[PDB]
């Protein structure tokens, strides 16, 4: 019993973290095979104005990099621009490289953050990509380059490298192709986050978890159809429901259909805060159907 | 920016997990040196009526154990009772044993859980020991023997091995000395959790984190002496405050003294009136001052 937001174990990723320094900047990189990937703002000069990154690369000198795995320093052979990342070729292969892939995550999907400082892992926690392509992380100065990952059947799927914090305190990365999530710029100029909405398909998963754990006080007797709910959602800070086949096994185990949970969601919006669900805010959207099925029933 | 309940990286503990099977029982053990520690109910022939564990040990057949680290099987040399644990001497030293200590945690303290099934880590999350010596876990069948840990200066401090779930779904372990937290029994008979109170010093830490992250709408201009607050606390489900030295740094960073936060707690203890603080709709006691200082300022 219980429901907790968990991270997948971090050991296989920990041995891939390096410290990457250039000039006055220091952040983290991801060392796989004979390449280190890191946010390109490590080569930028200090300025609140816009950075011409092609110019910064044109004046770069390879001997000004300092890249280290612990107290072992890696020699730099070359550098390539990769979107908002640098691909740095080094003279040593990481013998602890796991089997890995890259994958760009989509809104509402969960993954794991390995928060790193000075080229070493400090903390690990699960996150969920919001509708405005930000995550609700915890990062302070020095965290850039911290990776996000999922572990799928022995292969590490890398999906995020940390890049910046917005004025609201939420967090933005790029994928490992160098594409910034949400299209935000890797620039120091002021940008404000897009509007954020609760991810309704994840709220549905959370409410099924609550039923399985014996929480029913919030359950409506009424029903509302998916498309009518979706019309209400986009005026009330919630995302539309697109996928429902994923709920079939949860509806079968609990005896409760999606239309009943959608009506419950509308009512919870009306006395919002009056009571928690399993000790959480009643409209919690950080859990996916997959995470719930794993925690309730196993892998 | 941000505040997240996070775990310390799990890599050094993952290499210590083994699968321990006996008869119809399957759980997890902790392999350090040439010893495997696991909950002694692995040798119980029921978990349904009161168990004479000394008898169970006296009729044990060493060969009926199956202990494995991945696909490496460990030979059992002998078995000793250690409180609510078995101390199993095995024929191989774990070469990946980290530097480690044991320590029994106290109410209000945080640590990390590595949830394990079939002798392998599946998830990691942070917890905080309640005043009734239970934790807010997520565990299903097969999780017993999952360890709790902290890491300090590269030394692993083991403080918990998972033992049982109480009727309400909260979770109980033993320390690595074999002493059950809270004096609960490692017996299948009926047990109910004791009364629980919110840990006020942790609620204070959370409100300081909220201030550092720009959440101030709830902050009282009024204040209340620690004396007066403690009279209210014991009739309102909260612990008394005696240590305020742990807030000196946070009060200096924010300019807000403890007495104003105590008045705010009184106002917020019933509800947040429909608003949120760092995403919460009710007070949380899961964060210590140490976690908050680390996440806001590093170390
Ligand atoms: C890389 O370590 C850093 C991570 C930030 C630092 C504070 N919390 C974080 O997550 N990223 C940057 O400093 C980034 C560099 C740009 C060239 C992309 N800029 C940034 O995040 O500053 C925006 C900001 C505004 C207001 C408060 C805090 C940060
Ligand atoms: C060890 O794997 C197991 C972990 C429980 C199982 C369900 N969630 C857990 O944390 N511990 C026990 O099964 C324990 C055995 C002692 C009483 C000897 N008994 C227990 O936890 O209460 C029984 C129970 C079983 C299944 C669900 C809820 C309670």
Author numbering:
A (entry chain B), B (entry chain A): 1 to 299
Paper text:
Like all the other coronaviruses (CoVs), PEDV has a RNA genome that encodes two polyproteins, pp1a and pp1ab. The majority of synthesized polyproteins are cleaved by 3C-like protease (3CLpro; main protease, Nsp5) at 11 conserved sites, which are essential for viral replication. The coronavirus 3CLpro employs conserved cysteine and histidine residues, which serve as the principal nucleophile and general acid–base catalyst, respectively, at its catalytic site. 3CLpro recognizes a conserved cleavage site containing a hydrophobic residue (preferably L) at the P2 position, a Q at the P1 position, and a small aliphatic amino acid residue (S, G or A) at the P1′ position.
The glutamine surrogate ring and the leucine of GC376 fit comfortably into the S1 and S2 binding sites, respectively. Hydrophobic interactions were extensive between the protease and the compound. Interestingly, there was only electron density (contoured at 1.0 σ) for the 46–48 residues (STT) of chain A but not for chain B. This result suggests that the part of the loop is flexible and that its orientation directly influences the entrance size of the substrate-binding pocket. Thr 47 in the loop and Asn 141, which is located on another side of the binding pocket, both protrude into the pocket, forming a narrow entrance with the width of ~8 Å.
